[PDB]
Amino acid sequence: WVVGMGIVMSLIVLAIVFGNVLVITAIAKFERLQTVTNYFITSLACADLVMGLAVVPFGAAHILTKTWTFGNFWCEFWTSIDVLCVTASIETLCVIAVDRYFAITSPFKYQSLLTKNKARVIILMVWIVSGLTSFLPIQMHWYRATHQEAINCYAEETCCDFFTNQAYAIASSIVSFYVPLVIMVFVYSRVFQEAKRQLQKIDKSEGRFHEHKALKTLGIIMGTFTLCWLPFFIVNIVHVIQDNLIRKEVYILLNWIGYVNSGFNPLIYCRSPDFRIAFQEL
Amino acid sequence: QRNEEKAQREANKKIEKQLQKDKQVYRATHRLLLLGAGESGKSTIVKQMGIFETKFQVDKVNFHMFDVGGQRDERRKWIQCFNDVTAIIFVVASSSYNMVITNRLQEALNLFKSIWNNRWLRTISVILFLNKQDLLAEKVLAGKSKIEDYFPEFARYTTPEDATPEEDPRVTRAKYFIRDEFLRISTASGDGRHYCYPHFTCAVDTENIRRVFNDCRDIIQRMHLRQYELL
Amino acid sequence: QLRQEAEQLKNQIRDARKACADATLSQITNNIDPVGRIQMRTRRTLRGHLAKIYAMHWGTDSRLLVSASQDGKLIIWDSYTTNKVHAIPLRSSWVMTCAYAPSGNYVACGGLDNICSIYNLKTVRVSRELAGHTGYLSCCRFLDDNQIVTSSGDTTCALWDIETGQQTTTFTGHTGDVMSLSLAPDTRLFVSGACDASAKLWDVREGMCRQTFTGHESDINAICFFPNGNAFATGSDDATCRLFDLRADQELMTYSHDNIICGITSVSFSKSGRLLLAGYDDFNCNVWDALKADRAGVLAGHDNRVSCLGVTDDGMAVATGSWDSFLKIWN
Amino acid sequence: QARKLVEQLKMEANIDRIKVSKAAADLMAYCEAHAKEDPLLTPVPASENPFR
Numbered sequence: 025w026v027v028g029m030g031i032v033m034s035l036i037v038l039a040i041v042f043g044n045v046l047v048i049t050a051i052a053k054f055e056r057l058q059t060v061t062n063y064f065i066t067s068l069a070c071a072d073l074v075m076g077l078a079v080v081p082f083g084a085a086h087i088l089t090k091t092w093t094f095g096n097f098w099c100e101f102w103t104s105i106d107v108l109c110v111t112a113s114i115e116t117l118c119v120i121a122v123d124r125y126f127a128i129t130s131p132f133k134y135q136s137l138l139t140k141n142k143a144r145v146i147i148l149m150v151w152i153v154s155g156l157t158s159f160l161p162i163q164m165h166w167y168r169a170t171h172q173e174a175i176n177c178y179a180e181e182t183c184c185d186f187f188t189n190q191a192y193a194i195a196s197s198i199v200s201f202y203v204p205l206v207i208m209v210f211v212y213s214r215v216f217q218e219a220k221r222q223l224q225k226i227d228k229s230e231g232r233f234h235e236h237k238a239l240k241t242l243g244i245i246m247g248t249f250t251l252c253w254l255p256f257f258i259v260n261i262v263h264v265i266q267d268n269l270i271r272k273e274v275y276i277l278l279n280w281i282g283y284v285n286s287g288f289n290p291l292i293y294c295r296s297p298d299f300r301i302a303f304q305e306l
Numbered sequence: 307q308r309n310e311e312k313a314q315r316e317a318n319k320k321i322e323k324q325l326q327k328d329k330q331v332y333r334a335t336h337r338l339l340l341l342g343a344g345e346s347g348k349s350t351i352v353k354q355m356g357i358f359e360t361k362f363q364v365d366k367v368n369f370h371m372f373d374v375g376g377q378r379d380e381r382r383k384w385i386q387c388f389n390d391v392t393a394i395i396f397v398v399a400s401s402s403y404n405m406v407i408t409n410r411l412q413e414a415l416n417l418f419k420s421i422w423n424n425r426w427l428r429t430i431s432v433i434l435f436l437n438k439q440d441l442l443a444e445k446v447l448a449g450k451s452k453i454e455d456y457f458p459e460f461a462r463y464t465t466p467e468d469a470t471p472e473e474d475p476r477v478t479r480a481k482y483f484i485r486d487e488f489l490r491i492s493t494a495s496g497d498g499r500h501y502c503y504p505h506f507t508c509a510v511d512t513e514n515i516r517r518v519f520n521d522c523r524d525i526i527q528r529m530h531l532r533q534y535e536l537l
Numbered sequence: 538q539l540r541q542e543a544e545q546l547k548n549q550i551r552d553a554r555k556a557c558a559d560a561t562l563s564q565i566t567n568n569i570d571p572v573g574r575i576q577m578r579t580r581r582t583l584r585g586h587l588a589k590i591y592a593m594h595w596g597t598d599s600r601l602l603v604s605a606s607q608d609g610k611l612i613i614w615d616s617y618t619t620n621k622v623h624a625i626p627l628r629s630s631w632v633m634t635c636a637y638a639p640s641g642n643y644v645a646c647g648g649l650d651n652i653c654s655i656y657n658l659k660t661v662r663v664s665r666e667l668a669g670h671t672g673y674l675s676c677c678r679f680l681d682d683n684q685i686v687t688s689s690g691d692t693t694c695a696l697w698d699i700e701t702g703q704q705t706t707t708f709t710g711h712t713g714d715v716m717s718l719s720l721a722p723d724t725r726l727f728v729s730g731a732c733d734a735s736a737k738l739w740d741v742r743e744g745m746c747r748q749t750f751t752g753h754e755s756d757i758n759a760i761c762f763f764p765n766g767n768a769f770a771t772g773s774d775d776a777t778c779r780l781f782d783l784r785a786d787q788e789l790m791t792y793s794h795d796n797i798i799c800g801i802t803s804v805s806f807s808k809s810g811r812l813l814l815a816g817y818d819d820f821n822c823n824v825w826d827a828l829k830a831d832r833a834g835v836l837a838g839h840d841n842r843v844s845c846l847g848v849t850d851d852g853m854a855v856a857t858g859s860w861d862s863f864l865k866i867w868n
Numbered sequence: 869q870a871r872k873l874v875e876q877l878k879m880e881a882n883i884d885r886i887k888v889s890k891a892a893a894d895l896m897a898y899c900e901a902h903a904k905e906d907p908l909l910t911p912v913p914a915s916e917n918p919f920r
C-alpha cells in the first residue's frame with residue numbers, strides 16, 4: 025500500500041504547484057488583470073504555492089518513511105512554515121469577502137475606500153500577523169508540552185511529532201480559523217440580502233414581460249472552505265481537553281484533508297472570461 | 307549632455323505628480339448624457355432642480371451632465387463617444403400622440419429603438435422621463451381626442467392589475483399603455499446587460515434629482531452584482 | 538429638364554474613364570518579387586492618459602509627438618527617452634483631433650464644441666480661438682504658422698487666418714459629414730473623405746473642387762496621400778481599402794480579405810510608399826503591399842480599438858494609439 | 869441648387885486623363901527607385917537604430 029499511497033501524494037503536489045504558478049504568471053504577464061482585487065488573489069496564490077512547495081513533500085516523506093532524518097532544527101523550521109502558511113491563507117479569504125462587501129453595499133465610496141497603497145498595507149499587515157503567530161512562539165519554545173512523552177519526543181533526534189499545550193492550541197485556533205469564519209458569514213449574509221432585494225425590484229418593475237445563481241455561488245464558496253477546514257480545527261481544540269478521545273491517525277488525516285484545500289482556490293476565484301482568455305493565450 | 311538628462315527627469319516628476327491628483331477627481335465623478343425628442347421640454351427639467359455642461363452635487367457625490375444642441379441631424383456619428391457614461395437620460399413628451407408635426411410619439415419610439423440597439427451603447431442603462439403629464443390628463447379627459455384612432459393597438463388594452471394609480475381610470479390606462487410601448491422594446495433586445503427606468507414627470511416636480519441619484523445607485527449595484535456572478 | 542442633363546453628364550464621365558483602362562495595376566506588377574514577411578516588435582510604451590485616445594500627430598523632427606484623450610489633456614511626449622514634456626488641460630473634455638505645427642511652435646485642437654484652439658508652446662497658454670463652424674470638428678492640418686485648414690460635421694471645410702481669426706475661403710459640395718483630410722506634399726491641394734462615400738480633390742488657392750471619386754460603399758473614415766503625390770488611399774467601415782489615381786481619375790486596386798468584417802479607423806503609407814498600414818476595429822493593425830495586395834504582417838499588441846496611426850517623416854518608427862489609453866512605438 | 873450641380877459636372881468632365889498603363893508604371897518606378905532608403909522594408913542594424 026506504500027507504493028499506492030505514494031502515488032496519490034505525488035499527484036497532490038503537482039496539482040497545487042501547476043494551478044498556482046499559472047495564475048501568478050497570467051496576472052503578471054497581462055496588463056488587463058492588474059486590478060486592485062487581483063492583489064489579494066496574488067497573495068493567496070503565493071501562500072498556497074509556498075505551502076505546496078515546502079510542506080507537502082517533507083510531510084509525505086515523513087509519513088512514508090516513518091522517521092525524521094533532517095535533525096531537531098529542520099523539524100521546528102518545517103512546523104513554523106506549516107503554521108505560517110496555513111494562517112496566512114485563511115485570512116486572505118476574509119479580505120476578499122470584505123472587499124466584495126464594500127464593493128456591493130457602498131458603491132459610491134468604493135473607489136475612495138480602496139487604493140493600491142491601502143491594499144499593499146493590508147497585505148503586509150496580514151502577513152506580519154501571520155508571521156507573529158507561527159515563528160515567534162514556536163522558535164522560542166513557548167508551545168512546548170510538559171508530559172514525559174513530549175519530553176522524550178523533543179529529546180530524540182529521529183522523532184518529529186506535534187505536541188502542544190492548551191493555551192497555544194486554543195489561541196492559534198482562533199486567529200487562524202474562528203475570527204475569519206464569523207466575519208465572512210456576516211459579510212455574505214448581507215451580500216445575499218442585497219442580491220435578493222435587487223432581484224425583487226427587477227421582478228416587480230419588469231415581471232410581466234418575462235435566486236439560483238447567487239445561492240449556488242455562495243453555497244460553493246462557503247461549503248468548500250468550511251468542509252475543508254472545520255473538522256480539523258474542531259479536533260484541534262478537543263484533543264487538548266480530552267487526551268484519549270483523539271488518535272494520531274485521525275489528526276493527520278484531517279490535517280491532510282485541510283491541506284488539500286490549497287488546490288481548489290484557482291478553480292473558485294479564477295473563473296471569468298478575462299482569466300479564461302489569459303489561460304488560453306498561454 | 308549629463309545635465310540635460312537630469313533636467314528632463316525633473317519636469318517629468320512634476321508632471322506625473324500632477325496627474326495623480328487629477329485621477330482622484332476623475333474617478334469620483336459620474337457623467338450623464340441628456341437627450342430629447344425635439345420639443346420634449348428637457349430645457350425646463352434642467353432649469354428647475356456647441357455643447358452645454360452643468361455640474362451639481364447631491365449627498366456629497368459629484369454629477370456632471372452633458373446636453374448637445376450644436377448638432378442636429380438624423381445620423382448621430384458622435385454617439386460613439388458616450389460609451390463610458392453612467393446612464394442616459396431620455397426625455398419624451400407623452401401628450402403628443404395626436405400632433406403629426408408621423409406623430410411625435412412614433413418618432414420618439416423609433417429614436418429610442420435606434421439608441422437601444424447600438425453597437426457601442428450595449429452596456430448603458432436609460433433613465434426615461436415621460437414628461438407633460440397634466441396635458442395628457444386633460445386631453446384624455448377631453449372626449450374628442452382618442453388614442454386608438456392614432457394607435458390601433460389601444461382598442462385591446464386593459465389596465466394592469468399590479469398598478470399604482472393615484473386619478474380617473476382613463477388617464478391611468480393611457481399612461482400605462484404609453485409606458486408599456488417603451489418597455490416592450492426595452493425588454494426584448496437586451497439580456498441583463500442594461501435596463502430601463504421609466505418615470506412620470508410633470509412641470510412642478512422637484513424630486514427628479516433624487517430619482518437620478520437612486521437610479522445611478524441601482525445601476526452601479528446591479529453592475530457589481532452581475533460582475534461577481536451573483537445575478 | 539435640368540436633372541436630365543445631369544444624368545446625361547454623369548453617363549459620359551463613366552464612359553470617358555472606361556476607355557482609359559488599358560490594363561490593371563495587378564497585371565503589370567505580377568512579375569515583381571514579393572516583399573516576403575515583415576515582423577515588427579514594440580520598442581516603447583507610453584503611459585499617463587486617464588481615458589481613451591482619439592488623435593495623435595508626429596513631429597517634424599521625428600522625436601516628439603502629441604496625443605489627445607477624452608479626460609481633457611494634451612500631452613507632448615519624448616519618444617526616445619519616454620519623458621513627458623508638456624500637459625495642457627482643455628476647457629472642453631470632448632476632443633476629436635489634434636495637430637502639430639511644422640515649425641514646432643504651436644499645437645492645435647478641436648472637438649464637439651465646434652471650436653479650434655491654438656496653443657503657444659514656446660512662450661503654454663491659449664493663443665487663438667476660431668469659431669464659425671456649425672458642427673463638430675473632425676480634422677485640422679497646419680499649412681504654416683499663420684494659416685490652417687479644418688473640416689467639420691456641417692459638410693464643409695474652411696481655410697483660416699490665425700492672425701485675424703477669419704475664414705479666408707470655404708469649400709462646399711459634400712452631402713455628409715466630412716471625416717478626414719490630408720494635405721499634399723507641396724501644400725497646394727488636399728483631399729477629403731466624407732460620410733456620403735465620396736472623396737473630392739480641392740484647390741487651396743482657387744477654392745473649387747476638381748475631381749470626385751465614388752468607389753466606396755459606406756462612410757469613409759481615413760484618407761492619406763501617396764508619397765509621390767499623384768495617388769491616395771482611403772478606408773471605410775466596410776472592411777475595404779482602395780487606391781485612387783489622380784491622373785487616371787479612377788480606382789486602381791482594392792485591399793480586402795474574407796476573414797475581415799470590421800471597420801477601418803486609420804490608414805498610412807510607408808516612406809517609399811510600398812507598404813500600407815491600416816488600423817481596424819478588431820483590436821489590431823495589418824500591413825499590406827501596395828503593388829500586389831497581399832498581407833505581410835500583423836501588429837496585435839493593443840487591448841482596445843486602434844483609433845490613430847502615424848509614420849515618422851524619416852520612416853524609422855510607427856506609432857499607434859488605442860482606446861486602452863496607451864501609445865506604442867513599433868520598429 | 870439644380871443649376872449649380874449641372875455646372876459643376878460640365879466643368880469636371882472636361883479634363884485630360886492618361887491610361888492606366890502609364891500611372892501603374894509611374895508608381896512602380898517610384899517605388900523601385902526609392903525602396904533603398906526604406907527602414908521598414910529592411911531592418912537597420914541596432915547601432916543605427918535610435919529606438920533599440
Ligand SMILES: Nc1nc2c(ncn2[C@@H]2O[C@H](COP(=O)(O)OP(=O)(O)OP(=O)(O)O)[C@@H](O)[C@H]2O)c(=O)[nH]1
Pocket residue numbers: 342344345346347348349350437438439440441507508509
Ligand atoms: N404643462 C407643462 N408645460 C410644459 C412642460 N414642459 C415644457 N412645457 C412648456 O414649454 C414651454 C417652454 O418650452 P421649454 O420648457 O423650453 O421646452 P422646449 O423648448 O420644447 O425644450 P427642448 O425642445 O427640448 O429644447 C413652457 O412655456 C411650458 O408651457 C410640462 O412638463 N408641463
Ligand SMILES: CN[C@@H]1CCc2c(ccc(O)c2O)[C@H]1O
Pocket residue numbers: 103106107110111186193196197200279
Ligand atoms: C503540524 N500541523 C499544524 C498543527 C497546529 C496548527 C496548524 C495550522 C494552523 C494553526 O493555527 C495550528 O495551531 C497545523 O497545520
